């Protein structure tokens, strides 16, 4: 199912294996955000409705004569492209063909790492040339400051006060926590007079997973609830490769992906900024 290439089609889909097999090992952004289906090639813009206000239901009687809905405030986005290119040499592809050694694609698996980490910055800190807001840069994001995370047991104390600022604005249900690698090492201490690990003492309250990503700074952390209606990862193409021709004498390639992060209800995110100042 490929027109022309210096590879067998039986060999070409081995390259599509190892470019996604070493991609899902690295990705942490897609771990708790139900994204979308595909969108096809003919869609270069997406719309998201920043609600910024929500309230409860009503239970009175046989009905009413109006539709009390929230505001919409429609904003237009554009879809970037994240890519990285690798080169696959002649005279090693030729040498593996003459005496029949299976070819290694361990440049390509190294290439899909960097496109899955460049993807991971725009989902946290957000882009600038397309001004797409990150997960720690939106307006109305329920900030919360803390300090001195490791003395006895106040690590577990420091987030129950954080979910209470998130529970009183009518947001509950399944939560998710993302912690920087500095904070995750401190959470593996042993709890005083509970005599269980402090990370396991908190993984039954967040109930859909704590995580650790190197995209964050030192003292930081984000708790957000999952599902749709609050977060979305509208996508247009997944990790596809593409031939680029026989320039010079070798064979280059390019992997690419087209994602955006649209945040629908920004009031259901929190931020453990944790300064000393």
């Amino acid at each position: 199912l490929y027109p022309d290439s210096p590879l067998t089609d039986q060999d070409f889909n081995q390259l599509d294996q190892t470019v996604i097999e070493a991609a899902r090992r690295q990705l942490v952004g897609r771990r708790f955000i139900e994204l979308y289906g595909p969108l096809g090639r003919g869609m270069q813009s997406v719309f998201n409705d920043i609600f910024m206000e929500s309230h409860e239901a009503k239970m009175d009687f046989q009905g009413s004569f109006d539709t009390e809905v929230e505001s919409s405030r429609r904003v237009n986005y554009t879809i970037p492209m994240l890519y990285k290119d690798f080169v696959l040499y002649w005279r090693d592809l030729e040498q593996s063909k003459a005496l029949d050694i299976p070819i290694d694609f361990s440049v390509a698996a190294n290439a899909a790492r960097d496109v899955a980490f460049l993807e991971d910055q725009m989902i946290f800190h957000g882009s600038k040339e397309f001004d797409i807001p990150g997960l720690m840069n939106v307006k109305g994001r329920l900030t919360h400051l803390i300090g001195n995370w490791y003395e006895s047991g106040n690590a577990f104390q420091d987030i129950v006060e954080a979910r209470n600022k998130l529970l009183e604005m009518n947001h509950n249900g399944p939560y998710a926590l993302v912690l920087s690698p500095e904070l995750y090492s401190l959470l593996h201490r042993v709890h005083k007079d509970t005599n269980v690990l402090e990370i396991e003492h908190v993984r039954e309250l967040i109930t859909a997973g704590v995580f650790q990503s190197p995209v964050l700074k030192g003292k930081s952390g984000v708790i957000v609830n999952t599902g749709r209606n609050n977060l979305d990862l509208a996508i247009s193409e997944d990790f596809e490769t593409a031939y680029l021709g026989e320039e010079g004498m070798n064979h280059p390639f390019r992997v690419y992906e087209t994602v955006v992060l649209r945040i629908k209800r920004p009031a259901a995110i929190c931020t453990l900024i944790d300064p000393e100042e």
Partner: peptide, 7 residues
């Protein structure tokens, strides 16, 4: 045509 979803 979806290629790589982890969850």
């Amino acid at each position: 045509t979806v290629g790589s979803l982890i969850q």
